[PDB]
Amino acid sequence: AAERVFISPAKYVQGKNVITKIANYLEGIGNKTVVIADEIVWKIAGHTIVNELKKGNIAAEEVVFSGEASRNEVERIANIARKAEAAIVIGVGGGKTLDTAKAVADELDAYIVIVPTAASTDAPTSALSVIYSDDGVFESYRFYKKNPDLVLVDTKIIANAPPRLLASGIADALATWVEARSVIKSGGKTMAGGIPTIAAEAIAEKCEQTLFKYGKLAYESVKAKVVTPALEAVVEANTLLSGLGFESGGLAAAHAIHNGFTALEGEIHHLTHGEKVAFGTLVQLALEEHSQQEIERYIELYLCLDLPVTLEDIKLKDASREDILKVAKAATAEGETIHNAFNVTADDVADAIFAADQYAKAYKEK
Amino acid sequence: AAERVFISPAKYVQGKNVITKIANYLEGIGNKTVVIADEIVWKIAGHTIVNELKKGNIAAEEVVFSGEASRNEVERIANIARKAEAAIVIGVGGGKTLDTAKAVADELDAYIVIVPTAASTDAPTSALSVIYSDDGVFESYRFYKKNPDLVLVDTKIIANAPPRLLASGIADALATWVEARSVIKSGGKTMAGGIPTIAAEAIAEKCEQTLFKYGKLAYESVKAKVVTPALEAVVEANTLLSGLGFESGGLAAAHAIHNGFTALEGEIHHLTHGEKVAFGTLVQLALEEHSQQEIERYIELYLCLDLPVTLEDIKLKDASREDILKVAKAATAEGETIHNAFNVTADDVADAIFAADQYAKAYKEK
Amino acid sequence: AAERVFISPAKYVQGKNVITKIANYLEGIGNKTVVIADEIVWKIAGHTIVNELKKGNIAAEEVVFSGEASRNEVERIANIARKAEAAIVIGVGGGKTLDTAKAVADELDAYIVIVPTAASTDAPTSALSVIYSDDGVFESYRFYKKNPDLVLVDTKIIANAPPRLLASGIADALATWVEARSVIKSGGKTMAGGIPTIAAEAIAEKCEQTLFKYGKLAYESVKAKVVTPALEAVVEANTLLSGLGFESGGLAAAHAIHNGFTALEGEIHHLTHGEKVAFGTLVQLALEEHSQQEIERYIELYLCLDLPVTLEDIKLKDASREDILKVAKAATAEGETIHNAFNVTADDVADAIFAADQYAKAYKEK
Amino acid sequence: AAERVFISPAKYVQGKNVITKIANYLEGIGNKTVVIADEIVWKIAGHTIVNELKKGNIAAEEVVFSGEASRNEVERIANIARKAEAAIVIGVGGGKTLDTAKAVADELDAYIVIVPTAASTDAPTSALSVIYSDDGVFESYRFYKKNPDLVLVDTKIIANAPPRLLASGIADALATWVEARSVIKSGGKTMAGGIPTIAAEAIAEKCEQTLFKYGKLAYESVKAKVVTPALEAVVEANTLLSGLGFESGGLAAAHAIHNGFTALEGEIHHLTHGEKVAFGTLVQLALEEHSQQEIERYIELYLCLDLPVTLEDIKLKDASREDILKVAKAATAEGETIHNAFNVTADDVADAIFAADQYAKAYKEK
């Protein structure tokens, strides 16, 4: 019938203090690298990484990332890297830094090492970058012929990152099963190119189980800045499971709603990718046939993690029907992922956004 | 504490007649390839593949594989490939052909495409080759810095392969959960280098569930030479799930016993890799604490698939204690995988081999 | 209300080849021992033990046990031991040898080591010996102020002992929960002197679970003369769990029926202690309120282990009501254990013996 | 494979007013004893015991225990006992008195009777004493060739002991299953010398079940100073089950953390052994993979029993990372019990101590 496709980064390594073994993971690969990080991350981990590379006689061009994943920034860094004759690109930071590093590596056909300093999105493992305008407006997607070569996740670094970034990552990862399940049921396609494999289904379903079981303990672990088995499990769920699950499992309405928000200008854009996805996930559940108890199971967890569940929480308090319809039209554009699992109109989606807000308010009033 | 590592082939594609899209999956990669297959496989799929490559203006050096994964054969093919300026290596066939192709690709730093023509072992996705002497005697392992770039699995080709080869593949895949579970419980390491990830555990456990649910239907599908959803599920379990699960999930006693058989000369070596692993799996279960019902659940399935469950079935009828001890000493050598999950002596293992044979005989007498 | 009492041997050690560490377990204790075994056991383990003691500079008076646990034999060995100035008594063999060794140790106030060479009864751990006449007729009980100091159980030796002796031991151990449960429910006393403790209840109940789960696998292990985890579990159940469970958990009708058989002369006395107890256990179940399915669960296991379940199997085929009443009167004598859990007459018990035979016959006819 | 070892006191007797039968339990043993108790316990039970011994014509040297289990105190009492020609040592009181009595009995090779007047720790049944400096600083362990000969537990005396001492005993006993389960799973050793037996596993698991079922009722019973079936069950769990379970079942992280506190000076040392173990148990659970609900099940019970669950409760409010690391380094010293079940570093343990405190705080904020 249809072909099933699964893709994956070549190697994923996760553990406490693994950043100190970076020189060991590159011995056979090369001795000239470029390290990309923003100003904050240079202090948190960038210098530590350079030090470890120096101790291994690996050279490192130090690049200060502008802060936005834009074409101009990519061009700029690639030039610096070409000049430096870098064979390895090391991206260090959050989603925008990592997406930029992948683009730079593609331009150079270099080995790419992805070092997330927060478990805030499932960008790390994927074969795509989300490109923005220099001003921070979404512009396009950049797909690659390969997923990253090495994803190196140090849980000590992540235990010290802001709790809000772990909660955002849990939100992005909770969308995984909800969206992949909808694609599996509808016979739709994934970003990998075919129908999901059983491997992706197993991974996506385990992602949700892991988050419900350990998510709150992991959040408390980060608040106390310590590494625990609960945190190790949730960092893997937020990174490897969520990453494989969305890319090879499928996207549907939750991420389409997240994209629809770009049709609006405003304070909503100060929210993180995960915070927007949390609301988008409730909207997808409102478009599905679930009982009140089922939906409340997710609302309860989002609230415990201080994640947004109402239009007021996402800075659209008392938004107008017309504003919501702009989001819905953008979320239902040709090519969006919602069509992989639903046959709905923009009006159906606008109704579901208001419904989700109403269901959350009803829960809160208890 | 410990680091968890997961590795994987870059892309896995599975479906009916996917062999006819080979030219499409290589467009961006190159136009000069080397195709490796044995005499039988050249007729079954090798010519079809070359034809599709020609239609896409991709050149193909045709190589007839000797039949054994040996150093000499690897050297020979690599020379042919260098001369032909091949940038892509396509291995077509069973485990020995695929393991040889990986070695050839490593020598050339070429893109490697693995096209299994039977779902007989979990060799396809792994970053290692098992090397033998020209005469067919195990010699060593060859590990690589990368898993294969593309694994292309055509279920139409596999539906027409001998039922014995599907049963062998199911046997190799049934060892996956039993061995990975034992490594997860003991805190041991995997071939990927660290402790298992939750991803590998989910994959390995789903592997077993898939086989118990669809294995017999898949076997009947192959007997009738047709492709069904049951066959598609079992081919994925035998290839992608079993492959990731053993490599990134862990090996333990079952495969160590399989290796121990090389200490013996005889007709046992005409059995397939999977047939030997089926018995090795029963031995591992006899070394664990399981009730009779648990063990019989596996014996029952092996019998339905015409797989060996007694010493007589593996051509060691009335073998002596001394012969069995040679197997056990080889299976417990320093460096073997049994030590990742058990603290046993050769004598303990020799007793477990006889116990497994006795348990199977007791089941058969019913 | 009532006091609960638990007693136990000081140390229980079980494992493969532990007999070779005997000198190590006695280093601090003494250097002059007496070793008691019958002619058969001297060849199986007695000489091995003496050799290990010699290598440790521990002297050993070698005694050939007559074969019956009688007062005369005890006197004889004690004299030999006194003369030899033995400070340690080592009993090696089956129940009669061990019961004799305990008596000899009591006479001398010596340290006592119990080394069972078959897991055939729960005599090893208990603070009592069953004394017979020189001719093999029950005579009395001999209780001690202490349980044995060291019980050393070598599973390699037991794996090579006759399968019939393991089946007998499983039969003796299956009586444990059935009898202790009846004492716990009736508020009766145990041989330890008080009401059972929760510890004894936990031990007795786990004894039965262990036997149903691993008993058949252990029996098959012995048939093949190998040590497996199943055998290790059942040897512990037959020795430590059954021993603590009966002594500190309570005896009831099953063992009273076993004792009642001494009222008869005949071929029944060639059966083992465990074989007689298996039938006695069915009689106790026939005196309780169980459904047919419950009773058949035990009958099924006894048959699989080749244990007797009918009057014909215990050599009383077509026994007369008068003969059975002699058994019942003896089983209900003042002081017997049946009174700890039942308020029944000899006639009630004679009816239950015929009922058990009828229930077993009904099962066999299926 | 490995040998399993189980050890136990020779006789355990528990019941209301059993102290009045002490003369009866010693009739065959001797007529000259030494009775050890501190000033408070002499009034609560010491005089009553002497009176009962006098009525039986058994002499009794009265010793007032200093209050600390130190070498000097042991020497002092042993001298007094030698002079008195005492053949029996009777220790009456809490853990320190009992540990001292065992040492004195060892010096004299005397029969030892242990009479706990509170069910506050599982010291009663064990073959070891914890020795301190005269000033109250841990010094070493003193292991014996035998467990105590007689443990006599009067529940009437314990029903009148401070509720805090019963809660402490429940805390010590709740660690039993958590620690033994971790040793059973890891294949580690117990204090008895080998791997756990099934008997110890059954005992340890029943210990936890007993405490969850009857612990609160037993605590309320003591508050009202009455003996109830619930109290009888919990006193057995705190003494016999917890005692056998830890010694023959295994120790792991909970008790290692308890020992680590000796690296600190301060008010924490006024807490009881059980109060410290309660926190140590939460730390072990934080090092394991449990869901939030699982961990909260224990926190809820500790709070009901007024046991400490946070660093503030154990007098380390706002302790520094450096202070906690001293505890962790001491808890992970070579030879500590944590290594029997975990492969962790001091840093991993320091993180787990802060995590446990955070999880408890999160529960309390609800």
Ligand SMILES: NC(=O)c1ccc[n+]([C@@H]2O[C@H](COP(=O)([O-])OP(=O)(O)OC[C@H]3O[C@@H](n4cnc5c(N)ncnc54)[C@H](O)[C@@H]3O)[C@@H](O)[C@H]2O)c1
């Ligand atoms: N390609 C993909 O598959 C993909 C998937 C999901 C999300 N994304 C992309 O991810 C981006 C969002 O990424 P994000 O949420 O991580 O935000 P981000 O990358 O913009 O910002 C992360 C912020 O956290 C800070 N930070 C990182 N590590 C820190 C640490 N240890 N301590 C303190 N601060 C730290 C950074 O300095 C930065 O200000 C978007 O552009 C989105 O499109 C991409």
Ligand SMILES: NC(=O)c1ccc[n+]([C@@H]2O[C@H](COP(=O)([O-])OP(=O)(O)OC[C@H]3O[C@@H](n4cnc5c(N)ncnc54)[C@H](O)[C@@H]3O)[C@@H](O)[C@H]2O)c1
């Ligand atoms: N590197 C690894 O991880 C790994 C893992 C598992 C097994 N292995 C290796 O796999 C090898 C065993 O491989 P195998 O069991 O597939 O045997 P194989 O490769 O030796 O033989 C397969 C046989 O089946 C035939 N065949 C293949 N496709 C066919 C088709 N469609 N129709 C008819 N015949 C067909 C081939 O001509 C050949 O004779 C061993 O050398 C073992 O070490 C390697």
Ligand SMILES: NC(=O)c1ccc[n+]([C@@H]2O[C@H](COP(=O)([O-])OP(=O)(O)OC[C@H]3O[C@@H](n4cnc5c(N)ncnc54)[C@H](O)[C@@H]3O)[C@@H](O)[C@H]2O)c1
């Ligand atoms: N004191 C108690 O609590 C207690 C409890 C239960 C049973 N018992 C007593 O146990 C006795 C029955 O004991 P039993 O059933 O073991 O019989 P047993 O001691 O009379 O005989 C065992 C037989 O097995 C043989 N044997 C032992 N180990 C062997 C080995 N490794 N290989 C081959 N043969 C071996 C011995 O030579 C002997 O002939 C009775 O007298 C009964 O009263 C006592």
Ligand SMILES: NC(=O)c1ccc[n+]([C@@H]2O[C@H](COP(=O)([O-])OP(=O)(O)OC[C@H]3O[C@@H](n4cnc5c(N)ncnc54)[C@H](O)[C@@H]3O)[C@@H](O)[C@H]2O)c1
């Ligand atoms: N050897 C072991 O296995 C082992 C195991 C666990 C704990 N321990 C040891 O136990 C000791 C702690 O013992 P503990 O918690 O019982 O404290 P403890 O012995 O120091 O004190 C108990 C306190 O309670 C009082 N007390 C006892 N019975 C009483 C009663 N009926 N009414 C009023 N007060 C009464 C005593 O006078 C004393 O002040 C430690 O030294 C620890 O190392 C030893």
Ligand SMILES: [Zn+2]
């Ligand atoms: Zn996302």
Ligand SMILES: [Zn+2]
């Ligand atoms: Zn703003």
Ligand SMILES: [Zn+2]
């Ligand atoms: Zn295999």
Ligand SMILES: [Zn+2]
């Ligand atoms: Zn041959």
Ligand SMILES: [Zn+2]
């Ligand atoms: Zn018996």
Ligand SMILES: [Zn+2]
């Ligand atoms: Zn006869």
Ligand SMILES: [Zn+2]
């Ligand atoms: Zn304790």
Ligand SMILES: [Zn+2]
């Ligand atoms: Zn103080």
